[PDB]
């Protein structure tokens, strides 16, 4: 085999990877929509009286506070998780550093200028 075939396989991997990510994003959007429809159901204001609307609004405010409490707990969890992820990632960076600093070679002179200087008028396709 050759190396060009491996590069072609890798780039095909990348595009099929991106399409998969888009599909997963669409599935997550659909799951979010369905979960929203299940949890937060519409209201039924038809037939409610003056005091009944007041009681409904008070109940909605209580539900508002309950959901914010849940969200705040989940957000505290997410912040702890962010902190832990940062710590672990930096520890892994310190571990894996050692001798793996790379660079692209600079004596690799640009072909366009090199092609002009070597050929003159013969260089047309390159």
């Amino acid at each position: 085999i050759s190396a060009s075939r491996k590069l072609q396989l890798k780039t095909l991997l990348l595009q099929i990877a991106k399409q998969e990510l888009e599909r997963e994003a669409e599935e997550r959007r659909g799951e979010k929509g369905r979960a929203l429809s299940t949890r937060c159901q519409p209201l039924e204001l038809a037939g409610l009286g003056f005091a009944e609307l007041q009681d409904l609004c008070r109940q909605l405010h209580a539900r508002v506070d309950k959901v914010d409490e849940e969200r705040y707990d989940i957000e505290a969890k997410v912040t702890k998780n962010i902190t832990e992820i940062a710590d672990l990632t930096q520890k892994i960076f310190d571990l894996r550093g050692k001798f793996k600093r790379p660079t692209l070679r600079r004596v690799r002179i640009s072909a366009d200028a090199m092609m002009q200087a070597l050929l003159g008028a013969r260089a047309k396709e390159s």
Partner: protein
Amino acid sequence: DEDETTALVCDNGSGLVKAGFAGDDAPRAVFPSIVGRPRHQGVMVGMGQKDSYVGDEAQSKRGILTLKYPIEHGIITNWDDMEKIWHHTFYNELRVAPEEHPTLLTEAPLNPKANREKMTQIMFETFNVPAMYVAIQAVLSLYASGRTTGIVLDSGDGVTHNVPIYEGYALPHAIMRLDLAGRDLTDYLMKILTERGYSFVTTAEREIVRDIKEKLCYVALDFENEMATAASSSSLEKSYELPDGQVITIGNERFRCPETLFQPSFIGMESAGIHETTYNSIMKCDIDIRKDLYANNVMSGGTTMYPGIADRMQKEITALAPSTMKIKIIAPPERKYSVWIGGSILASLSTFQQMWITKQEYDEAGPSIVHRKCF
């Protein structure tokens, strides 16, 4: 990692934290009680932004991090270090959350109420724990010893507790704590080594000489006679090789370092030596059980790992007490972990599973009421 819903035994002893699951015979996560804080401010880019090291991560780097002791004499100085060491033990070694199993912690005898209320509040409000329990170390050590009678001498790092228990019975009135332990011995060795000629004034060297003491320092069988025979030293003085390579030569100082325990006058305190304080405690007990306390005395604490403590105790007590009865001193092997071991065997009983304190009753009652319920 754990398939049994059992309490995590975390002995937060002064100087060494020993954490492990219940049922085990030894703590898996053993690390010193120290907190390393970045001293300077670096312009470097890429290193961990973590602003608070702990445990082995701090032990590995003691030249850059200023070292602070999270516990002093027994009273908790800084609570941030407390939250750091528990959060670390939970989410870096054990790899388990406290929201799935209980936690049997061990605290020292005669501690402040602020300490207890603070740790309980951090373990209930902040962390979601189904149930907590505070336990005295002496009872668990006597459990691990496999007896019900004797006086437990627990010598930690900054405090020393003498606790008499006869017929499995506690005596809260006789428990007397004295802040003489490994730190004051490290300070005495440091000042006498400064008098020898090698002067240092930083904490990293203090921990190094503490380790040197743990490895080499022993107790003398006859102080003055060893002084006389060491005046002309030959095999009495030893040449230790520092982990860095500097050749240190230490002679008599070794067996004169723990001697400060027997002669607190060296540190200019009117307090009596550990042996004399224990003897006075025995007089404070009743005469009927005094012989049993003589025959069942038990020891605990890492400081007891020095060779020659049992014989010194026997000669001193024989010189103080009559020499007509029998005064046998028993020291169980691996006594230091024995306390923790007790915790393990204490967390497997179903009755103990019925003596835990759940969140809801604590929340309504409040921390102070919880203090009344325990004792």
